Design a protein around this ligand. Structure first.
Ligand SMILES: Nc1ncnc2c1ncn2[C@H]1C[C@H](O)[C@@H](COP(=O)(O)NP(=O)(O)OP(=O)(O)O)O1
Ligand SMILES: [Mg+2]
Ligand SMILES: [Mg+2]
Length: 418
DNA sequence: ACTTATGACGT
DNA sequence: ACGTCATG
């Protein structure tokens, strides 16, 4: 019934903003965004504080536009090195967080600001230690129970406590429900440890799988955690849009909506697994049939380290690189940042990348990557990497350079122990 | 002219 | 191996 494991998803609240606000006290408790490349339209927003969201400011907005919605908006710029954005500060901030999470349980780095946790084992330990002890409300100061309260509240904290009381009073409530509660107690502790040790606040979702735990985390932001039990799923999914569920945000979800003629996740229950398979594939049908019943089996991978390391730049419109000299210069600029990142990787993580991937895009092409080619990554030399990368894409030139290049991408892959 | 990184799947 | 999809 997918009530076998306890899985959590922890996600930092407006991460890049918190990172800047910690370092610059002035930006704290104020409408705040983080931008990059100020020259064109004040730059592009990649992170918005909650105060700034009250005014309607969103990521992928122009800073000049954001200022129109929010006159008093404070802006922080991404560091620029070698003529491109540099995310080093946010990656180091990430490492602090990932390290604190590691002490509690085994984690899967899902993004720079979020990881999954498997609390299944930890829950078992706590119960033996905690055996015969009731769970106090004090143990869950920031926990929301989805679907509660019900029955017999005007303030949001009042609703939270009321729901928490009903759930705790029942714990009536099964063995898998008790495990989620202990799972959540542990998440309270882990979240408190993050803020105390780094100054960063965050939200969390606690459930039986990664899809639900991720959905749960969203429900109460920021600085709150949410438990989505097995029993809540039917009511929660019933009015829940398909696009909301992870991996249904793009084309597949659209085709499910278009083919099946439904709009909510719950509506999938009526169809047989075979029906779903025939429409959307064997792998997807099977996945859909279980997910709408709240059952998901993807494992929490024990991976704290990124599989791959890469850098890229985009040369939109006029700025597009139409000469051999420019292509050579930016590969070198990219290869140089890559070398710094790669060297650090070896010292911290005892591993080396064996392959190098070059991806490029050209004018008139929609696709993120027009093409990609690879070659051997034998040495961490920016000049060699840049020179080799030129060699594997040099043919690409139809011609000077034609067509001019929209983007350059260099990626390191295939790391091995050492 | 929403950029810059990531991971997984299909074939 | 190379393209594509999905996500942050
Ligand atoms: N499309 C994008 N392009 C570039 N950088 C991005 C990005 N999306 C996110 N980032 C960077 C900047 C972001 O701060 C960060 C975290 O990812 P989120 O969790 O998706 N968003 P946040 O933590 O800001 O807040 P909250 O979760 O509470 O809504 O990654
Ligand atoms: Mg976040
Ligand atoms: Mg996130």
């Amino acid at each position: 019934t997918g009530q076998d494991r306890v899985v959590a998803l922890v996600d930092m609240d407006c991460f890049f903003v918190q990172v800047e606000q910690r370092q610059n006290p002035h930006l704290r408790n104020k409408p705040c965004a983080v931008v990059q490349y100020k020259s064109w339209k004040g730059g592009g927003i990649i992170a918005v504080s909650y105060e700034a969201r009250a005014f309607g400011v969103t990521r992928s907005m122009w800073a000049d536009d954001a200022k129109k919605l929010c006159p008093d908006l404070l802006l922080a710029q991404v560091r620029e090195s070698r003529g491109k954005a540099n995310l080093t500060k946010y990656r180091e901030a990430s490492v602090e967080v990932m390290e604190i999470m590691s002490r509690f349980a085994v984690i899967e780095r899902a993004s720079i600001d979020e990881a999954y946790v498997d609390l299944t084992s930890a829950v078992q330990e706590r119960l033996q230690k905690l055996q015969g002890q009731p769970i106090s409300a004090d143990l869950l100061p920031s926990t929301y129970i989805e679907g509660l309260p019900q029955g017999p509240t005007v303030q949001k904290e009042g609703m939270r406590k009321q729901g928490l009381f009903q759930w705790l009073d029942s714990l009536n409530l099964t063995s898998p429900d008790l495990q989620l509660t202990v799972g959540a107690v542990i998440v309270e502790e882990m979240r408190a440890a993050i803020e105390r040790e780094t100054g960063f606040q965050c939200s969390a979702g606690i459930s039986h799988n990664k899809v639900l735990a991720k959905l749960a985390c969203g429900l109460n932001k920021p600085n709150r955690q949410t438990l989505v039990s097995h029993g809540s799923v039917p009511q929660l999914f019933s009015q829940m849009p398909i696009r909301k569920i992870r991996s249904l945000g793009g084309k597949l979800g659209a085709s499910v909506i278009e083919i099946l003629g439904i709009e909510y996740m719950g509506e999938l229950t009526q169809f047989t697994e075979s029906q779903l398979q025939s429409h959307f594939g064997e792998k997807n049908g099977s996945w859909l049939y279980a997910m709408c019943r709240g059952i998901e089996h993807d494992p929490v991978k024990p991976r704290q380290l990124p599989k791959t390391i890469g850098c890229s730049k985009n040369f939109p419109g006029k700025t597009a690189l139409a000469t051999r000299e420019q292509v050579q210069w930016w590969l070198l600029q990219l290869a140089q940042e890559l070398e710094e990142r790669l060297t650090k990787d070896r010292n911290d993580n005892d591993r080396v990348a064996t392959q190098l991937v070059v991806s490029i895009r050209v004018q008139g092409d929609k696709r993120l990557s027009s093409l990609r080619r690879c070659c051997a990554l034998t040495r961490y030399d920016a000049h060699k990497m840049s020179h080799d990368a030129f060699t594997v894409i040099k043919n690409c030139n139809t011609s000077e350079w034609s067509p001019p290049l929209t983007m350059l991408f260099l990626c390191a892959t295939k790391f091995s122990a050492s």
